[PDB]
Amino acid sequence: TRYIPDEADFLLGMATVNNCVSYRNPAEGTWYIQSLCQSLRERCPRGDDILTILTEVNYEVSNKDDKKNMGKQMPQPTFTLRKKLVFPS
Amino acid sequence: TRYIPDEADFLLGMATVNNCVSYRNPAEGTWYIQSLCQSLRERCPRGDDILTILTEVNYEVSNKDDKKNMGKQMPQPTFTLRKKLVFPS
Amino acid sequence: XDXFX
Amino acid sequence: XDXFX
Amino acid sequence: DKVYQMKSKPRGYCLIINNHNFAKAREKVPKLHSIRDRNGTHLDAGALTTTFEELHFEIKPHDDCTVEQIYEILKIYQLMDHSNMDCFICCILSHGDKGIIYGTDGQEAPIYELTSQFTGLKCPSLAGKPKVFFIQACQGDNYQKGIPVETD
Amino acid sequence: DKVYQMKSKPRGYCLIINNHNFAKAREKVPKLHSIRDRNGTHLDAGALTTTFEELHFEIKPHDDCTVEQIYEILKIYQLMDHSNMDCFICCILSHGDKGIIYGTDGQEAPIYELTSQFTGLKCPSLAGKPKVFFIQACQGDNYQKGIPVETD
C-alpha cells in the first residue's frame, strides 16, 4: 500500500489573516461567508476548483470597506491538498 | 483610486506544516525545494498557475519517505493572492 | 452593532 | 548527517 | 491534473457550528465583558446550508456551542464511518482571537485542535479524502489597513 | 480569471538567503548545541537560481546570515524601487522551529516579521503585485507520521 502524511488533504479557509477582525453585517451575513457562498454557487457548476474559487473570494472581500474605521479584510486559505478539489453539481 | 488590504497578494510556501521537520538530503538538496523547482520548470512553460504547481509539490513530497524514522513531510502553502499567478516563459 | 467578529 | 532542518 | 474523487451521493457531511449567544462569555470571562451576540449569523448558516445542499452534502447544523460542546460534536464526527463519503466539511461561525475560536462560554479552542481531530490517524475513513474547514471569526482585534492601487 | 501582470523583464528580484554554517548557534544558544551545518544547501540555492533565472527573475543570493543580517537584507529590498517589476520572490533556506527561522547565530526571526516587511504600506512599489516567500526550514522537531491509503 502507499503512505502519505497524517496531515495531508486539508483545506483551511480563514476569513482573515492573523491579528485582525473579520466583518459581520447583521442584516446580510459576513463578508467572507456571503462571498464564499456566492462564488461556490456560481463557479462550482462550471467545474472550477476550490483554490481558484477562494482566490476570487480574496479578490471580492479585498474590495469591501468598513467606512467607519477605514478598515479592510484579507481572507487567507492554507492547504495540504495534494489534488485539485472540485465540487461537481 | 481603489484600496485593497495591506496584506494582500502574498504567497507563502512552507516546506512543512507546523511542529514538524523538513528533510534535506546532503547529496541532493531538500525534498521541498528540489520538488518545487522540478514542478516550476516543467509546468510554468505550460501556463500552469502557482497554486496548481504547489498542489503537485504537495503530492510529490507526500510520497517521499524517511525510512530511518518512518517519517513523512507535508508542505503547506498559505495565500492572500487575489488573482491567478503565472510565471510565463 | 452595525459591525465585527 | 544523512537527514533534516 | 489529479482530482479528488467527488462522486458519492451525498458527498459527505457539512457541519455548521453557528455561535450566536455570548452572554456566558460576557458573564464569565473578564476581558470579554463587551463581546457582542453575533446578530445575523443565521444568514450565514442558511447560505451555507443552501450552497452545500446544492453541492450534494448532508448538512449537520449546531447552534450556540461552548468549547466543550464543539469538541464533543467533532468527536462524534471523527468516530463516524465516512467510508462511503468522498469529502468532509466543517464550518465554524463564532468569535475568535489569534489562532483560536471562542465558544459561547468564552473559552478558547485553538484552530489546530479542531482540524487535527480529522487527521488520517484519528479518522482513517477520511484518509486520502479532502477535509475542508471554513472559519468565520476574528483572529485579533486590529483593523486591517487599506493601500491604494490602480483599478483593474 | 484575472491574472497578475507578469510581463516585465526582469520580472523582479528573487532573493535567496542560504544558511549553511551554524557554528555560532552551536556555541551561543544552549538548546542548539547539536544543530548541524546544513550540508548540501547550495544544491537548493543553485536549483532556485537556475529555475528563477529561466523564469526571468534577477537572482540576489546571500550566504550565511544571522537574524540581524537577514533583517538588513530585507530592509534593503523593502526600500528598493520595484516600480518596474511585476513580482518579488524571497527564498529562505535555514533551520527553524514553530513559526520561526533561525539565523546562523541561532537567534530567531518570526516568519511574519520577514513577510510583513513587504506589505503594501512598507513597500508601495509592490502594492497590488505578488510577493512570494518560499521557506525551507523545519517548523519543530516532530516527525510527521504516515497513513496508509490506496494507490492512485
Swiss-Prot record, chains E, F:
The modification N6-acetyllysine is found at K2. The active site is at H95, C138. Coiled coil: none annotated. Changing C138A: Does not affect localization to lamellipodia of migrating cells. Prevents DISC-mediated processing of CASP8. It comes from the Eukaryota. The modification Phosphotyrosine is found at Y112. This is Caspase-8 subunit p18. It comes from Homo sapiens. The chain holds residues 223 to 374 of 479 of the full protein.
